[PDB]
Amino acid sequence: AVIKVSEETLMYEVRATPSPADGTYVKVNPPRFMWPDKFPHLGPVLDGVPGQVDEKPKVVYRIRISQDKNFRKDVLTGERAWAFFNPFQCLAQGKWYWQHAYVTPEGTEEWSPVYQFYIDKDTPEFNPPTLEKVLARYPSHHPRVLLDADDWENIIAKNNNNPEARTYMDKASQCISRPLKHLQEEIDTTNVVTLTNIVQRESALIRESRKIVDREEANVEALVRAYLLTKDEKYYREGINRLSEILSWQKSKYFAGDFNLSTLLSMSTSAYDGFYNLLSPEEKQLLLDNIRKIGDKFYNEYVNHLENRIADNHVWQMTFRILTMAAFATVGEIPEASVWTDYCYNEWISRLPGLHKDGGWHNGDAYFHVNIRTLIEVPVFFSRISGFNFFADPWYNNNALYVIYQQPPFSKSGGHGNSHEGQRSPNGGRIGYADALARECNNPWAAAYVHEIMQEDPDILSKAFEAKPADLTWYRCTTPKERPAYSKHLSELPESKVFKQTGTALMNTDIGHHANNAMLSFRSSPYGSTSHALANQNAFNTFFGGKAIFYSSGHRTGFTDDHCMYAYRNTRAHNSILVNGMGQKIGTEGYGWIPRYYEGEEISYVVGDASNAYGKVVSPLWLERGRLSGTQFTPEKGWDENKLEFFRRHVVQLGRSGLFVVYDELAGKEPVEWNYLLHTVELPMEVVKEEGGLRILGKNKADGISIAHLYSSQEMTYAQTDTFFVAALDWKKRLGKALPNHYHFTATTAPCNKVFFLNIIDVHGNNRADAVINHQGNHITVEGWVIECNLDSEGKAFLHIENKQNGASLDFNYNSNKGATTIVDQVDGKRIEKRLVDSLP
Ligand SMILES: O=C(O)C1=C[C@H](O)[C@@H](OS(=O)(=O)O)[C@H](O[C@H]2[C@H](O)[C@@H](NS(=O)(=O)O)[C@@H](O)O[C@@H]2COS(=O)(=O)O)O1
Ligand SMILES: [Ca+2]
Ligand SMILES: [Ca+2]
Numbered sequence: 001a002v003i004k005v006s007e008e009t010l011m012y013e014v015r016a017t018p019s020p021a022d023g024t025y026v027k028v029n030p031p032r033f034m035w036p037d038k039f040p041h042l043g044p045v046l047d048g049v050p051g052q053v054d055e056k057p058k059v060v061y062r063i064r065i066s067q068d069k070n071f072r073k074d075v076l077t078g079e080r081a082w083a084f085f086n087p088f089q090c091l092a093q094g095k096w097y098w099q100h101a102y103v104t105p106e107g108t109e110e111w112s113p114v115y116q117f118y119i120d121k122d123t124p125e126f127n128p129p130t131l132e133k134v135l136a137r138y139p140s141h142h143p144r145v146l147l148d149a150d151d152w153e154n155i156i157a158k159n160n161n162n163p164e165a166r167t168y169m170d171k172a173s174q175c176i177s178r179p180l181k182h183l184q185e186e187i188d189t190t191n192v193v194t195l196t197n198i199v200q201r202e203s204a205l206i207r208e209s210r211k212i213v214d215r216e217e218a219n220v221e222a223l224v225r226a227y228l229l230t231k232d233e234k235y236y237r238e239g240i241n242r243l244s245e246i247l248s249w250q251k252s253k254y255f256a257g258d259f260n261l262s263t264l265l266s267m268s269t270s271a272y273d274g275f276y277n278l279l280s281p282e283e284k285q286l287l288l289d290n291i292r293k294i295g296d297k298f299y300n301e302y303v304n305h306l307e308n309r310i311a312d313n314h315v316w317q318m319t320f321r322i323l324t325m326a327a328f329a330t331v332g333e334i335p336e337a338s339v340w341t342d343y344c345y346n347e348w349i350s351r352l353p354g355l356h357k358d359g360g361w362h363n364g365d366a367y368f369h370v371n372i373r374t375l376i377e378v379p380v381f382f383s384r385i386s387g388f389n390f391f392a393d394p395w396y397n398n399n400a401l402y403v404i405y406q407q408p409p410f411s412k413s414g415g416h417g418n419s420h421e422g423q424r425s426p427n428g429g430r431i432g433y434a435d436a437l438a439r440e441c442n443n444p445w446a447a448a449y450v451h452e453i454m455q456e457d458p459d460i461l462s463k464a465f466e467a468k469p470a471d472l473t474w475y476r477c478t479t480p481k482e483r484p485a486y487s488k489h490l491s492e493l494p495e496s497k498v499f500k501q502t503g504t505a506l507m508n509t510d511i512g513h514h515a516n517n518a519m520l521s522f523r524s525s526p527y528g529s530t531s532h533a534l535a536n537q538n539a540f541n542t543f544f545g546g547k548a549i550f551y552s553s554g555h556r557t558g559f560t561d562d563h564c565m566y567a568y569r570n571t572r573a574h575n576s577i578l579v580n581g582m583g584q585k586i587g588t589e590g591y592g593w594i595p596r597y598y599e600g601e602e603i604s605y606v607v608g609d610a611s612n613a614y615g616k617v618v619s620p621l622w623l624e625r626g627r628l629s630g631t632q633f634t635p636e637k638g639w640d641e642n643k644l645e646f647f648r649r650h651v652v653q654l655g656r657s658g659l660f661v662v663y664d665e666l667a668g669k670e671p672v673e674w675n676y677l678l679h680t681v682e683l684p685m686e687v688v689k690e691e692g693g694l695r696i697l698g699k700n701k702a703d704g705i706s707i708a709h710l711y712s713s714q715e716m717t718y719a720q721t722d723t724f725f726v727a728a729l730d731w732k733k734r735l736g737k738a739l740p741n742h743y744h745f746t747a748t749t750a751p752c753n754k755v756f757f758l759n760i761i762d763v764h765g766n767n768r769a770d771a772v773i774n775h776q777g778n779h780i781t782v783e784g785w786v787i788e789c790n791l792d793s794e795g796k797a798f799l800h801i802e803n804k805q806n807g808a809s810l811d812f813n814y815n816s817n818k819g820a821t822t823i824v825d826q827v828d829g830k831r832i833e834k835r836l837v838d839s840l841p
Contacts, residue, residue, distance in 0.1 A: 001819030003595060003838035005612060009588045010526035010841070013621050014040045015083075015308035018100070022115045027357070029123045032350050033063060033085040035112065036308060038102040043305045045624045046560070047257050047314065048202030052624065056304055060103040069097045069114065079103075082343065084307050084350040088130045093119045126392060131345045134386045135331065142276030145269065145329045145381070146228060147478055159229050159477055164461075167473070169235075172226035175219050176238045183249040186212045191734040199560060199629045204732055206257035213260045214468050216246050220267045224274040225474060236275050240283055243271050247290060258301075262319040265294040269326045292334055295326045299340050307347055310588065311355050311362060313531060318469050320344065320352075321374040328381070348378060356527075359398025360502025363532035364417010365406060366556075369429050372470040375399075376436045380475065391440040400437050400446040403430065404490065405497045405506040406521075409453045409514045411546030414506060414521035418532040418564075419556040421681070425546070426453060428461045429470030435461075436472055439481040444488040451486040496604035496653055498597040501841050503527065505597065505606040509656040518658035518763040519543040522651055524592030524608025526841050528585070529569060530619065535584040537592030537610035538649040539574035540662065542698075542706040544765045549698045549706035550575055553679040553742035555728040560629040566637055567724040577647060578675035578746075579614055579668065583638045587619025595648075595838035600825040602808035603801075604653035605836070607821075615642030638725075643668045650799055650821075652810060654785055658764045659771060663789055663812075664757040665797045671751040676716070678708055678745040685720055685745050691775045694718060696745055703765035709773050713756040713791040714749040754793040807831065 018035040020026045038059055044050035063085045066075040078085045083100070096117050101109040141149045159165035180186075188208055195201035223239035226232070247264060249255050272279070272287040279287070298319060306312050306320070327340035353375050354361070361368040379390035407413040407430070413423035431453060437446040453460055465471075491512025498505045503525025509518040521541045529535035534552065542550040552575065554568030567573055571583030584590040592610040617623060617633040626633055633639045646667035653660055666674055678685065678696055686697040693711035710716075722741045730736030749755055760782065762771045773782050780787040788800040798813035812821040823834040 001817070001837040003840060005593070005609075005840070007612075008618075009528070010591045010593065011310055011528070011588045013310050013530065013588060013619070014042050016040075018112070018115055020115075020117045023117070025118045025120060026123060028126050029090045029119055030087040030127060031091070031117060033065075033087075033098070033100070034307065034350060035061075035083050035100045037083050037304050038110070039304070040308070041305050042621060043301070043309075045621055046199065046628065048206055049199050049628055051628055059304060062101040062103060062109065063098065065096060065098040067092065067094060067096055071097070081339075082303055082307055084346065086346055086349050088127070090125050090127050091119055093121055093123075124394070128349055128382075128388045128390065129386050131342060134345070135341070138328075138331070138385055140332060143228070143273045145273045145325055146224070146474075148384075152228070155478055156229060156231070162477065164473055165229055165477055168222045168226040168229060171219065171222040172235050172238070175223060175242060176234055180216060180242055180245045182245070183209070183212060183252050183254050187254050188734070189254070191732075191736075195731070197630060200558070200731060202256065203558065205254065206260075207732055209254050209256050209260055213246065213249075213263050216242065217263050217267055218467060220246070221270060224270045225477075228274055229477075233278065236278050239271055239275065243267055244286065247286070258314055258319060261294060262298065262314075262322045264290060265298070265326050266322045268294070269322070269329045273329045288330070288334065291326050291330055292336055295323055295330075295340055296336055298323045299336075299343060302347075303343065307350065310527075311531060313363065313367070316352075317367075317370045317374060320347075321378050324348070324378060325381070328385070345382070348382070353379070353393065354395050354399065356499065356502040357395060357398070358499045358501040359395055359400070359402045360499035360504055361399075361402060361406075361417075362502065362527050364420055364534075365413035365415065365423045366419035367417055367532050368406075369427070369465070370469040372429055372433045373472065374469070376433065376440070376472060376475060380440070380479070396437060396441050397443055400434070400441065400443045401497055402499065402502075403434050403437070404445060404449050404493070405508075405511070408508070408511050408517060408519070408546065409449065409490070410456065411514050411517070411519070412543055412548045414504070415541040415548070415552050416504065416521070416523055416536070417534065418559070420552065421555065426460075427465035428463045429465040429467075429472075431460050432470070432472035432476070435483065436475060438484055439479065442484055444484065445490070445493065447484045447486060448488050448490050450483065452490055494599050495601065495656065496599045496606075498594065498599060498606055500594050500597070501526070503592060503594050503608070503841065505594065505651070507604055507606075507651070507653040507660065509658050515545045516767060517543070517545065520651070520653065520660050520761075520763065522606055522608060524594055524610055524649070526591050526593050528588040528591040528613070530587045530621070534569050534574065535571045535586060535590055535613075536574040536576060537584055537590065537613045538608040538647060539576040540651065541575060542660075542761060542763045544658075544704040544706070544763055545702070547700050547702050547704050549680060549700050549704045549763065550678055550708070550761075551681050553681055553744065554724060555730075555739040557728055557730055557739070558732065560625050560631065561731065562631070562726050563724065563728045565626075565629075565631050566726050567728065570638055570725070572638060572677070572725060573679065575678055576610075577664065577666065578677065579644050580640070580672050581638065581675060582614060582635070582640045582643075584610070584613040585615050585619070585639070586617050586633070587622045589618055590614070593841050595840075596821060596836040598821075598823050598825070598834055598836060600808075600823065600827065600832070602655045602803065602806045602826050603810060603823065605810060605821065605823065606651045608649045608651070610647045610649070611644060613647075614644045616640070643670060643672050645669050650812065652799075652801055654783075654801075655803070655806060655808065657771070657783055657785075658762065658768070659782060659785070660761045660763065661787060661799075661801060662757070662759040662761060663799045664755075666755045666757075668753055671753050673751050674714075674749045674755050676710065676712070676747040676749075676757055680743045684722065684743045687718060687720065687745065690773075694747060705762070705764050705770070707762040707770060709760040709762070710747060711758045711791060712747070712749055713754075713793045714752050716747040716749055718745065718747045720745050752793050756789070756791050756793070756797060758787075758789050758791060760787065
C-alpha cells in the first residue's frame with residue numbers, strides 16, 4: 001500500500017524521456033509525440049543575465065509510427081526541425097510502435113529504441129485540423145487577427161452601445177497631439193545606478209524600462225482598438241506616431257529584457273493588422289521590418305528549447321502568444337511566417353495549455369494571472385479560423401475548479417508561488433478569465449463564480465489589476481457568445497478538491513459562503529521548488545472568512561535575491577518541517593507528491609510525501625543562478641547533506657467543523673533535531689503549555705483565529721521570533737526599505753531517529769468559540785470526534801479518527817490495514833467505504 005520513490009527528480013527542467021511514455025495507454029487520440037533534443041538545451045538562465053549558454057545547432061528529426069513493428073505496413077512518417085509531432089488523425093485501436101530519429105548534417109539517421117503505446121475504445125479523441133486546412137481557408141484581407149474584416153461592421157455596430165468599448169476612445173483621445181518623449185527622458189534610472197550586483201542592477205533596469213514601455217503599449221493598443229471601433233483616422237495617425245517613437249527606443253542601452261522586445265512585436269502586429277489598409281509604403285515597411293526582425297529572434301530562441309523546457313515562463317505568459325499573432329498576421333506575406341505558424345500551431349497542440357493536466361497552475365497564485373490572455377486569446381483565435389473548438393481540451397474545465405478553489409470569492413489566495421502574499425481578493429482579470437471559461441466551455445461553476453462575485457461587487461471587472469497580460473475587454477467586445485445563465489451555486493461544490501498532478505489540496509467548510517469559510521490549503525508537489533514555486537512541500541496554510549491566519553511568511557522582493565532564497569522560497573518560511581534547521585533543495589529535486597487522498601462530505605483527507613525533498617542543492621539551473629546572484633547554498637544558509645529517510649504529512653478535514661488534524665511520520669538516517677514550524681503575518685502567536693503538549697494561538701487583525709494543539713512523540717522546546725533569516729529589503733524600489741516583519745514559531749524536539757507529531761488545528765472566527773480539546777481515556781476527543789494515534793518513536797505509525805454521531809471515520813495503520821488508509825463517510829444518506837493506497841503522479 002505504501003510506495004517508495006527513489007528518483008533524483010520527478011520532473012525535468014529539460015526533457016529527458018519520450019512522450020507518450022513506453023508501454024503506456026495514451027490519454028488522448030491522436031497522441032502528442034515529444035522527445036528529448038539531440039542536444040538538450042537549457043538556454044539562458046535569467047532574463048537580464050544569460051549566464052553560460054551552449055551552442056544550439058539547427059537540427060532535423062524524423063518519426064515513424066505503425067501498428068506493424070517492422071514499420072512496413074500503414075506507417076505514419078514525419079520530418080520536423082523540432083522534437084514534437086502531431087499526426088492530425090485519430091489512430092486505430094490496439095498496440096502501436098514508434099521511434100524518432102536525429103538526422104546528422106551528413107544525412108545519417110540515429111534512430112531511437114522502438115517505443116510502444118496503446119489506444120483503447122475508451123481513449124478520448126481531441127483531433128484539431130491540419131495547419132494546411134486552416135491556412136487554405138485563411139483570408140488574405142486585413143484585419144484578420146484582431147478581428148476579421150467580414151465581421152468588422154457588425155462588431156462596430158454591436159459596440160456602439162457597449163460602455164466597455166467607450167474606454168478605448170477615452171484613453172486614446174487623451175494621447176492625441178500629446179507628444180511622447182524619448183526613453184532616456186521618461187525612464188527613471190536613479191535606483192538602477194545604485195546597484196552593484198549585476199543580477200539586481202539588470203533586473204531593476206528591466207523593471208524601470210518596462211514601466212515606460214508598458215504604459216505606452218496600453219496607449220498604442222487603445223489607439224488601434226479605438227480605430228477599429230470608430231474608423232476615425234485620428235486614432236490611426238496618433239497610433240502610428242506613438243508606435244514609431246517607441247520602436248525608435250529599440251537600440252537604447254535602456255531597452256532591456258525580452259518582454260520589452262516582445263512588446264514591440266505585439267504593437268507592430270496590432271498596428272499592421274488594424275491599420276493595414278491605411279499604411280503608407282514607409283509605414284508598412286517599418287512595421288514589417290520589425291515583425292521580421294523580432295519574430296525571427298523569438299522563433300530562434302524557442303526552437304529546440306521551449307518545447308522541452310519544463311515551462312518557459314516569459315514565453316508561456318506572453319511571448320508565445322505574441323509570436324503566434326505576428327505569424328498569423330503575416331503568413332503568406334513574409335516567408336519567415338510560414339515557419340513561425342508551423343511551429344506555434346503545432347507547439348500549442350503538442351502540449352498547451354498548462355503543465356499540470358489536472359488544471360492546477362504550476363507557478364502559483366499570482367503568476368496564473370500573467371497567463372490569462374494567452375490561455376484565452378490563443379484558443380479563441382485558433383477556434384475561429386479553424387472551425388474547431390480548441391476549448392474541448394479537458395484542461396479548461398479542470399482549470400475552472402482551480403480558479404475557484406485556489407481563491408474563493410472575496411478571499412485570500414491559497415498561498416502558493418512567488419508573490420502569493422499580495423493576492424488578497426479575486427481581481428478583475430481573474431473574473432474576466434472565469435467569464436471567458438463560462439462562455440467558451442459552458443462551465444456552470446465558472447458561471448457561478450462570476451455571477452456570485454458580481455452580485456456582491458458589480459464593478460469588479462473595472463477594478464485594479466495588471467492589464468497587460470490579463471485584460472479580456474477586447475475579447476468581450478468581439479465574442480458573439482453570451483454569459484450562460486446562472487445555474488449551479490458555489491455552495492453545491494465539494495468541500496475539498498485535490499489536484500494530484502499539481503500536488504495541491506484545498507479544504508473548505510463553507511466555500512459557497514466565503515465569510516463563514518474555514519479553509520486549509522496544502523502542497524506536496526512533483527514540480528518541487530523551481531521557477532516561481534516555493535520550497536514548501538508538506539506545508540499548509542489556514543484561513544477564515546477569506547483572510548489568512550497560519551501562513552507562509554516572507555516577502556517576494558525578487559527572483560534570486562538573498563531574502564527570496566533564505567527567507568521566502570526557503571522551507572524555513574513555511575508551515576512545514578526542518579531537519580537540524582535544514583530545508584528543502586531548490587529546484588525540481590526538492591519534490592513532494594500526494595500518494596493518496598479522499599474528497600468527501602463528513603470527512604476529507606490528503607497525504608503529502610516529502611521524503612526526498614531535502615539535502616544539498618544540485619540543480620544545475622539553480623546552481624548557475626546562485627553563482628550569478630551571490631547565493632550560498634551552504635549549511636549556514638539552510639542546506640546540508642540529507643538526513644531525511646521519510647516524511648509523510650496526513651491532513652484530515654473534520655467535516656465542516658473548522659477542525660483539521662495534521663499527523664506527521666518522520667524518520668531520519670541518524671538521530672536529528674526536528675523543527676516544527678508555524679508562521680503568522682499580522683500579529684505574534686501566543687504560546688502556552690497545554691496538557692502534554694503546546695497550544696499555539698494564531699490570529700489576524702480581523703475576526704480570524706487558528707489554534708494549533710501540538711503534540712509529539714518526543715519532548716519539545718519552542719521559541720518565537722519576529723525576525724527574518726535576512727531582511728526583506730525592497731531593493732527594486734527607489735530608496736526601498738525593509739518590508740514588514742512576520743512571526744515565526746519553531747518547536748524543536750530532542751534528537752531522535754524517528755518522531756511523530758499530532759496537530760489538531762481549530763480554525764474559526766466570530767462564528768463560534770474555541771473548540772475544547774479533551775484528553776480522556778488515553779485518547780483525545782473534540783466535538784464528538786475521537787482521535788487516536790501513535791506518538792511513540794519506537795512504535796508503528798497509526799491514526800484513527802471517528803465521529804460516531806456523523807458516521808465518519810479514518811483508519812491509517814501498518815497492521816491490519818497493511819499501510820492503507822480506510823475511510824467511512826456519509827454521502828447523501830449513504831454509507832461510503834473506501835480503502836486508500838498509494839499511487840504515483
Ligand atoms: O513574468 C515573470 O515570470 C517574471 C517577471 C520578471 O521578469 C521576473 O521577476 S522579478 O521581478 O522578481 O525579477 C521573473 O522573470 C524570470 C523568469 O520567470 C524566468 N523564466 S524561467 O527560466 O522559465 O524560470 C527567467 O527568465 O528569469 C527571469 C528573471 O530574470 S532577471 O530579471 O534577470 O533576474 O518573473
Ligand atoms: Ca507562469
Ligand atoms: Ca508554491
